[PDB]
Symmetry: C2
């Protein structure tokens, strides 16, 4: 009753990529992300290694150091907003999330309506995450930047 799934999970590049959203969350350290008071939801991305991950992460492990930009398109008003989700941890493990202003957005067009959510994923090497490339203990190349799309209906803050 507090967590709202978005679309269905995608399984590409050795990871299950799922989206959900909550009420806006108070997150420390404060100041990095939108204050909970100024947001309407807290969009999150649940990304974990699939069985037989091609990059050395055991099944179920959280895929870290990923660069994830997002785009929220209200297809009914045509309004679009961009951003990036941030690594953090909660009651149920690490994830990428962000507090997002929906109806409280000043520019307008982000209230009740149908939505097209896109995650733009870039591999961890962008942030210097290392990768053994020796013959014995090396893992294969990371995926190239890709995107996944979900559809959902926004009806306000998860009450």
């Amino acid at each position: 009753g507090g967590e709202v799934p978005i679309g269905d999970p995608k399984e590409l590049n050795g990871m299950e990529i799922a989206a959900v959203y909550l009420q806006p969350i108070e997150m420390e350290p404060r100041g990095i992300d939108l204050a909970a008071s100024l947001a309407d939801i807290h969009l999150e991305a649940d990304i974990h290694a699939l069985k037989n991950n091609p990059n050395g992460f055991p099944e179920g492990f959280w895929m870290p150091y990923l660069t994830i930009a997002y785009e929220l398109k209200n297809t009914d008003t045509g309004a679009i907003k961009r951003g990036t989700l941030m690594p953090m941890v909660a009651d149920h493990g690490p994830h990428y999330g962000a507090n997002i202003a929906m109806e409280k957005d000043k520019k307008g067009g982000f209230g009740v309506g149908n939505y097209e959510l896109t995650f733009y994923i870039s591999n961890p090497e962008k942030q210097g995450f290392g990768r053994h490339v020796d013959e014995e203990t090396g893992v294969g190349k990371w995926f190239e930047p890709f995107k996944v799309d979900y559809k959902f209906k926004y009806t306000g803050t998860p009450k």
Copy 2:
């Protein structure tokens, strides 16, 4: 293969072990010392314990931590200091770094007994956040601390 270092510590809800292998070719090329100019690849295995106080499931890797190392040739008294960087190999993510021992031209870091010190700071310091709301929140991270290890260096393993 994998040479263990000392015995694994357990504190602050973490499994903390120390290992070192032969020098490793790591990409992107340029962030860590080249394996050609290093004698060992020092690694640090850190995973969440059962009932982790910061919301990490049992066995999960602990990411975004800042683990600074120190190696002290107790025979020569030489002191080496640096950082371990996050990476991944054939058997999961970890923090590692290639270190120049005998090949370090400043000398004093050859064979002998060593003192390994892990300076560990919690993931916040790298912008990693945490929920602090009443429903999904988790407890505060640990304060900076240190775990010390015991190993006798014989050269590059093989």
